[PDB]
Amino acid sequence: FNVAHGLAWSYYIGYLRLILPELQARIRTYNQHYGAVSQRLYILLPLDCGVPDNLSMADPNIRFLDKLPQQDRVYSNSIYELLENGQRAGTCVLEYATPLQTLFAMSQYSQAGFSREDRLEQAKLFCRTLEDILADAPESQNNCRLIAYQEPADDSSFSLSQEVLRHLRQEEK
């Protein structure tokens, strides 16, 4: 019923609690060897549940730089540069919360019992649950940040790059 609760816990249990303890060392290794990449995993949480199929960002101000190197479990995490009026303004490890894509897909399948008009409610519950987990989680040692956003309801202009930079600059301050 409250499907997003279980998905948040699973996402923590089966992914975040495994990848997050080794992230800082992977980033410090990249910053030593291969314009420093910021220390946290930035997790994009579009409340419209729109995650591109290729996991690629359409915003040309969010430009793919490189894969993080590894620490039988291969983790593909991407480093992006954030541009603002033509200028490199930040560099971070960025990815979508893929369980939101699962909410979207469930809403499309007749036998999932997941109404199309419940995506927003479930997305918000996913965000709330995940933020509550991360607040009491030992593997989160200042190494992920949740970026939840809804684009304007009138379909006015939205900048995902500006959304991310606001969060990065809060961590600067």
Ligand X SMILES: CCc1nc(C)oc1C(=O)Nc1nc2cc(C(N)=O)cnc2n1C/C=C/Cn1c(NC(=O)c2oc(C)nc2CC)nc2cc(C(N)=O)cc(OCCCO)c21
Binding-site residues for 2',3'-cUAMP, in ranges, read 15, 73, 98
The interface region with ligand X, picked from 7-15, 24-32, 128-136, 155-163 by CB under 6 A, is 7-15
What are the two backbone dihedrals, phi and then psi, of residue 92, each rounded to the nearest 5 degrees?
-155, 165
Q: Which does 133 bind (CB under 5 to 8 A by kind): its own copies, ligand X, none?
A: its own copies
**From residue 110 to residue 149, what is the string marking binding to ligand X with x (rule CB under 6 A)?**
----------------------------------------
Can you say which residues are annotated as belonging to the binding site? 10, 15, 73-76, 98
Q: Which of 1, 14, 152, 170 binds ligand X (CB under 6 A)?
A: 14
Residue 9 interacting entry, from ligand X, its own copies, none, C-beta within 5 to 8 Å by type: its own copies
Per-residue burial over 95-124, b = 16 or more CB atoms within 10 Å of its CB, e = otherwise: bbbebbbbbbebbeeeeeebeeeebeebbe
Q: How far apart are CA 160 and CA 38, in angstroms?
A: 18
Among 165, 144, 16, residue whose Cα is nearest residue 85: 165
Report the residue number whose CB is nearest to ligand X: 14
Residue 43: CB minimum distance to its own copies, A: 16
Q: Residue 45 pairs with which residues in a beta bridge?
A: 148
The least distance separating ligand X from the CB of residue 19, rounded to whole angstroms, comes to: 7
Question: In which residue are the tokens 């649950």 written?
Answer: 129
Gyration radius from the chain CA atoms: 16
